[PDB]
Amino acid sequence: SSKEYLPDLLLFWQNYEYWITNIGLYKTKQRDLTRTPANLDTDTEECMFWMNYLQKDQSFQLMNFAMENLGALYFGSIGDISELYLRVEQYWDRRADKNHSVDGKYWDALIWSVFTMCIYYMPVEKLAEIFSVYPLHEYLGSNKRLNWEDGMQLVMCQNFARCSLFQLKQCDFMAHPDIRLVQAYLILATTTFPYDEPLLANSLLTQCIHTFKNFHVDDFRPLLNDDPVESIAKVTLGRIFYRLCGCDYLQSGPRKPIALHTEVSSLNSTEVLYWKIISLDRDLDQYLNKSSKPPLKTLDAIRRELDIFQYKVDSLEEDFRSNNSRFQKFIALFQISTVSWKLFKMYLIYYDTADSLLKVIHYSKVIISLIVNNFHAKSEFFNRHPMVMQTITRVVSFISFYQIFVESAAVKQLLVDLTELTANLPTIFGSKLDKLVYLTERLSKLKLLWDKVQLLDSGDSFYHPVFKILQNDIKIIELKNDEMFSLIKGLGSLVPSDFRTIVEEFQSEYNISDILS
Amino acid sequence: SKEYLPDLLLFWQNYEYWITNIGLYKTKQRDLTRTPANLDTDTEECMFWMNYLQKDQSFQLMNFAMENLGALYFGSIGDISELYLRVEQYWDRRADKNHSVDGKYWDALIWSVFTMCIYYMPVEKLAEIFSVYPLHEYLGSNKRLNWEDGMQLVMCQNFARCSLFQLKQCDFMAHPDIRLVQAYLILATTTFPYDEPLLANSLLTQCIHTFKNFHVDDFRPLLNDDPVESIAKVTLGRIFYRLCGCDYLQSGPRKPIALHTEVSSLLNVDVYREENSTEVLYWKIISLDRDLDQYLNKSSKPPLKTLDAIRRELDIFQYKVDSLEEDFRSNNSRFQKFIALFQISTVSWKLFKMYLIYYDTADSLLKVIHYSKVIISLIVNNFHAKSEFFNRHPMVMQTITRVVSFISFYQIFVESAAVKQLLVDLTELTANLPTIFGSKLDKLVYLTERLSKLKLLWDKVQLLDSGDSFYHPVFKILQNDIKIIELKNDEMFSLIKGLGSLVPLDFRTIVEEFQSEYNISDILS
Amino acid sequence: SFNPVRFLELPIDIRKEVYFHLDGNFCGAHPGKPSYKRSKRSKKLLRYMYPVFATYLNIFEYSPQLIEKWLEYAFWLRYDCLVLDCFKVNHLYDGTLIDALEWTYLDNELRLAYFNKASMLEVWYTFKEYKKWVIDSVAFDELDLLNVSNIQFNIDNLTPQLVDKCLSILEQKDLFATIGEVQFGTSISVIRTIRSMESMKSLRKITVRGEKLYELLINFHGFRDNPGKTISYIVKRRINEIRLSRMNQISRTGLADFTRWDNLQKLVLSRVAYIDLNSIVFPKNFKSLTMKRVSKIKWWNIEENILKELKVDKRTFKSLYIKEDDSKFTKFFNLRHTRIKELDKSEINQITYLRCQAIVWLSFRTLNHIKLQNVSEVFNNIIVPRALFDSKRVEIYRCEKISQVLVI
Amino acid sequence: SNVVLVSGEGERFTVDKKIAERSLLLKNYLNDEIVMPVPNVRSSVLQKVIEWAEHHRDSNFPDEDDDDSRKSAPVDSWDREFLKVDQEMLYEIILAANYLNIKPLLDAGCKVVAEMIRGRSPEEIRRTFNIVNDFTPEEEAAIRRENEWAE
């Protein structure tokens, strides 16, 4: 036909984008509330069964690892970890106590949350000497031969997070909201855990907001008339706010109605810009309910300030024993590539500008080049850091939805290299990675049914099945995330032209209920 | 002359907020290193409190609740008989160990109902139902004392804290549901927020995160919508207005995430008038009250048209209190008009008080005497026979705080005629309060006689003047105690504790003498 | 025999309410001869006390009795402490009781005159003579009451040369932030003040009289391409109130639209022959709309919508559904002229009932204040919800011909 | 059906249950014969109040929020001379009606006290103009010295 198909779908693609690739496949668990049991059984005793694998030199070697590598992760809450060394030997002596303090097992909860994140960046050989496989397989007991490249590097991390959070509920932070709730969350929720538990992590960040903004601090700048303790404490507290509100963005959605990302408006050395990129990231996206398409005058301003953004990181020169440095520039280059690619998608989707395609294709080349250097030797663990499972979701879902209705010549080639590099991702993401691969196959067979059945139109209104499938997709994600069903089970006592039958050859075959759990 | 009166009562506003509403209820600053962690023994005691309650005791407690207290659960649960069905399912339910989430949220609700029912429960019926001993062969501190000597108070405390532990046991933190909020609203009419402010504020933040994650704004039922969803919508709305009402009574600087974004008489605020009239008038009164009382910390002054408008809808509410259906034998109806008369006296009393502080308009002393007179009139008419439990609502610990601290600050500087008589009858009836409030009641009497001792230091020590301002030891210590509540409720100190290693650190003779003999840093407990 | 030695030591509410009864007529004496004066020595009075009273009051240039009054009268009424005390008390309200304070240009200092009801001037001040004692003796030190922005502009009595002279005085000396509202009543006067309305930063409320200017200045009515005569959109986000005084029929073309003016909040309307409210598109939020002394009412045309979504006849809608109750509440207000009608609690209850409130409240479109004064010639029967007849945001004071008002 | 109240110095006034309703701030006191204090009004002042309330209990009193029947109303034929007793008793009457929250006598005394201002001559404006030192003395010298010449 004519070129009239493109804005009808591409301005429905984004409403599909934020309703599939971000909420239904990440940030919802449908829960039947007449399923889960009490927690005095099966949720206490096995935790103090999962303490016992940790002994002295193992945790000490873990700390020996955790210094020379992670200078964009630990520095949000620590500085130097000599405080951690001292605090873990009074931990090691504090295990001999019976009725403990509050502050002491807060320190226990924080160091358990340190190990929880710290083992989740082990390449598997050093965790092969620093653990043994055999003592665990008796109560979970699925099988006995499987090794750490499957299963245990997920569930061991999940239950390290579970023991940390168990000392948080056990010391009852709701009566003693000390700050260390917040830098518990900051170190801990780096890992997959918000994706595994959205509903826990959302309310626990709400308690973290209660912990923070009940300090009433607005003055953050350094001073001259006060004791140095105030200056260094404020140095720590400001950056804790910065990374808190960044991780508040990365978790944000409609399953969290308390925000502090609204309380910041738009416009060592490296940690100050990790919030500036996210600060320019918010207003690229918050246009779904806001049906007003963005005027261009914003986008080019962002476009010029990115040029100074890779002006400054050009001026950074690294140390080559400090793998600290490779990690921090890996976050840096991947973040600027993320926002740049994401804004060029907006350029191509509302203005359809020429030369935007070629820069998108070269701007999906940067992220894959960055991945292909960091596979060979002693460089593998950067890929486990979870911004990537955002952007690979966006790049695969967008490039697939651009090849289903428009054939581009070499962009099939990047699609097949991109969906094979999807298949060679580290296993630590697990179920969500498999979930994405299933969705990719769904869109490919959607492309097949696009070329196998063609359009019917009588007036000026489209009738082809694919559009009805995606409308059904959004409608059922709405009907399942309708929470007033959860309300009426809350009160509980009140009891809870060819388009005839040509969807159940598809929606009964891949239902959309193979996303939720 | 009397030139202290303008620059006095404004500083009384600053004191009236920052002692009688945060320094005496919302301060529970403890140290952390001393405080023992719950590992066990806050677990194991209340299976012993479970089987201490038997079945017919629960049924007669429910008969108590349906017959007379019928103005507190009606904002939460409506009908009574479904909870008869539900306690039937609980007395069949306990014999399972793998209890589901739904039943144990249901027990969250029904323990909240017994906790709220034992708070208001008169001792003459409670003594002949329960027995005194098995508590005291659990814990030995005293051997011989009846319920009214503090056992009702600790029963309410333990009931509440391990109903909350049962919520902890069910992990509310991933399973939001409306019955957590309904458990709060039935528990908000106990004094537990006064006993534990930090716990109640954190779990009200989870009440807010429960509710506002439902994204319901309009609470009228639509046309294109299910009948069962319509009734669910209207009951959701009644829950919202009662939660905002019980959120204001808690409010202060200890929650930074507050719900209330409405208006009543303005002439990011969102909504206004989403229900007609059954019990929404309560929130109307409270919204009048918040417009009066935001100025307690605000340094500005009220324009008179606002307070004239408040006076106007008090003339309206003077008949909206009466226009409820009169029920001659129903005594929950007289509980409701007790509630309504006491609110419309309470807010208007602070209105006329604010008239006196800033604008000094006609009769604005003798009016305040008239309204304190009618408050004490209500308290003495509800005192004779079969009608005693009304005075246990935790607002009458607020307004008596308000009135006593005002009139005792009136007689320190101004020696008027009959207000001696009103103060002596007010302190006489303060000593005749119902005997459950415990520490806060006696410590209010401590503060009362503190300022009564300050009365005798007024007219003994003379004045010193700097040309325009009087200098006087009272004029020093009355800002010193505000400064010490400043220092106590500022939590930057705790951040110096929680981080790092370094720790922080003839007027005079009578000033720190009266500091040492009558310290104020004692509400810490 | 009044004395003003006292009567600044009355209570400030009584000093309000005596001035509440004293609107702009603070003094009362008000009803071939070629302008013989018959004044003894006054030939230099009419140079500098009647050059401008002749222009503003030309009805009484003849004046068969009152010729000598207003010359010698307002030598001191701008310094009498009672009227100056009125301008003490009503700044302390930020102008609620009797505002009526506009700008005039005359005698080359821009006198901030005040007029009465009959548009006869009384009192005048100039700028640094006004905010030296009239303001600072009520506001002591604090800085929010030292902002006056309730001063109208009101070009219907200034001849146009006075108008475009009093525009160009605020450009070089920045008094534009002071200006409050502006009254109107093609006309050559009104267009000057709107293309001279670039940035005042201080407009709240608007009054326009008559049909012909209302059709071209407030209604969008589809058209958005006016070359000159901008109503520019930067200052379009400022307004709160719309006033219409006298009309014939508000929608003579087709439609009384306010697709723009999204921040509007109150609409007062006045002595107007025709209103059909379906012609008003009712912008996204305004909680108050009112009218006074109206003479033809069509009243949303939605009672039959209730008739058709409850699926009965009008006669059956009347003969058994209405029972004429008066339980306890409605004896409180008088309203002996009105017959309130009420729906039922038994034959429809809990269902087929709140949907009726849904049909009412989809039409009422987020408003609550109605304030209907004197009525005549209603056509469609008046319907109010429970949520607005209780708690008295409905009020009909002098209700002369009205019956079958009904509350749901 | 006979209710009483006590004055400023203390006297007994039986009225009736329905004549007493015009004090709405007595109707906040009849939530419950019953006594009521008004300590700032003397005997004869409220004797005037009770005679007013007794004779216009025989009539209807309008909506008290409209600015139409307040800002322009007849005073009465009766209330002209029975509220024209004296200058100073009117102040005691209007403070008393401010107490008892009977708005119509408050406005009816406001009618007569309004009349004693609309109609004061321009020759006390000659002299009673600077009772309170508002302008500093140089400019009330000045105000006569841009007005040296008309008298």
Residue numbers in the entry:
A (entry chain O): 53 to 319, 339 to 567, 588 to 608
B (entry chain L): 54 to 320, 331 to 568, 589 to 608
C (entry chain K): 3 to 33, 49 to 202, 256 to 478
D (entry chain N): 4 to 35, 74 to 192
Paste lines from the article.
We were able to observe intact particles of the CBF3core bound to the CEN3-601 H3 nucleosome and obtained the cryo-EM density map at 4.2 Å resolution. It allowed us to build the structural models that showed multiple conformations for the major core region of the CBF3core. The major core region of the CBF3core showing multiple conformations is connected to the Gal4 domain through a flexible linker and moves as a rigid body (relative to the Gal4-nucleosome region). Examination of the available structures of the CBF3core in the free and DNA-bound forms shows that the major core regions have the same structure but display different orientations relative to the Gal4 domain. In some of the conformations, the Ctf3 subunit is close to the α2 helix of H2B and the L1 loop of H3. We found that the Cbf13 subunit was close to the five charged residues of the α2 helix of H2B and the three residues in loop 1 of CENP-ACse4. The model suggests potential formation of a salt bridge between Ctf13 K282 and H2B E117 and hydrophobic interactions between Cft13 P297 and CENP-ACse4 K1987. We mutated the residues in the α2 helix of H2B to Ala, deleted the three residues in loop 1 of CENP-ACse4, and measured the binding affinities of CBF3core to the nucleosomes containing the histone mutants. Each of the two mutants showed little effects on the binding affinity, and when combined, they decreased the binding affinity by only less than a factor of two. These results showed that CBF3core only made weak and dynamic contacts with the core histones.
